[PDB]
Amino acid sequence: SKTFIQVX
C-alpha cells in the first residue's frame, strides 16, 4: 500500500 504524505 502506497502512502503519500504532504510535507510543507
- Residue 1 grid cell: 500500500
Q: How far apart are CA 1 and CA 8, in angstroms?
A: 22
Q: How far apart are CA 7 and CA 2, in angstroms?
A: 16
Q: Residue 8 class from Cβ within 10 Å (0-12 exposed, 13-18 middle, 19+ buried)?
A: exposed
Residue with cell 504532504: 6
* SS3 assignment, position 2: coil
Q: How far apart are CA 2 and CA 5, in angstroms?
A: 10
Q: How far apart are CA 8 and CA 4, in angstroms?
A: 13
